[PDB]
């Protein structure tokens, strides 16, 4: 049974965790409001991993499907304002 | 088994998906799209927030490909962000 | 095997037929040949059109979709811009 | 067996062909040296796989497509160099 | 089993080799710091033959590229060919 998943970051909310026996990550993509400056993600231990880098005048967005990520996740907007989004699905 | 495709606008910024499996292929903006950024989402089913899938611009980035995604009906897309025309292409499994 | 069609405004579509039950669609390229103009190549139904791509030479010039599989017959159809866009992919 | 599999292609060395399996093909990226120009990059028998140029589009990724072997890959358009990655398999 | 990789190529560390039944290193996406200046980055797998170039990004053009799905055996050795990063690589260890 696979659940779609979503969620956003941002300088004001820079973190966020998934914590269903593995996550699918789809996209990640920068929202209409954020500022000019690269966009960063990492993964957090349980040091970082960049996984993605996004600029609005470049790149808007991101597919990387077909990551499968084992749960606890922690992601983090480790450089930009964001908005930045991030899709997938939970699947077990 | 059978192809599939839809336009979302300001004049339809929401459709809905029902019949097993959506595979979900590319989002492409229309050359008739204006400049400014455009946003896709995919809405929870009712039963927490609706969840991006794609972040597109004229100017910059005009598709994208996610071949690999695969989603259960009833999916709702809703166009966000942006006028459009977007396209959405895929397969019904 | 291997397939590959060029469509332009002299070409407008490219059928496919022939095992050959299947298309593996994999890029879709825009020529050096191609003006400047955004390009929109759609799946036509045998007898609403379905958009597979949009390209434009100075923003983003090709595309890949491997993983994509089609069913025969296979009409493309150059619905917007002057090409020529080639197509490439691999009868199965 | 898998090997690791990369070519360069260039207006000094138009083609290159890879024979004794099934080469998966990786990344096609233009080199930092190349020029301006849009490059084109076909399979001959041709069949174009890539457009790419150096200020809009350096590189893409094709993890998925498989050939069968013997294959040709001709730098049809542009100076190059441009690069190729994949694996061989068995 | 699966573990989640990165690694980081720079000017200082202009090389970095994945050592050792079996391991795969599935490698995922490469992306450059927003700390990297403007040069072209190549980044190639040196043999354990030619180097492979894997990758050309440029901050002001591409900055990021996904490769999920290549399946790398161990010995890898990635090399920072072309400019000074840094640059991110993200992927997992399987098995």
Redesign the interface.
């Given at each position: 049974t696979?659940v779609?998943?979503?969620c956003?970051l941002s300088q004001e909310r820079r973190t966020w965790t998934f914590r269903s026996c593995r996550l699918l990550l789809?996209?990640i993509?920068?929202?209409?409001k954020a500022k000019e400056?690269?966009?960063?993600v990492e993964?957090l231990?349980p040091?970082?991993?960049?996984?993605?880098?996004?600029?609005?005048?470049?790149?808007?967005?991101?597919?990387?499907?077909?990551?499968q990520?084992?749960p606890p996740v922690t992601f983090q907007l480790r450089?930009?304002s964001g908005p930045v989004?991030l899709?997938g699905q939970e699947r077990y």
């Open positions: 696979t779609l998943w979503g956003e789809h996209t993509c920068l929202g209409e400056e690269m966009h960063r993964i231990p040091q970082p991993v960049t996984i993605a880098s996004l600029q609005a005048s470049v790149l808007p967005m991101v597919s990387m499907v077909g990551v990520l084992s450089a930009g989004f899709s």
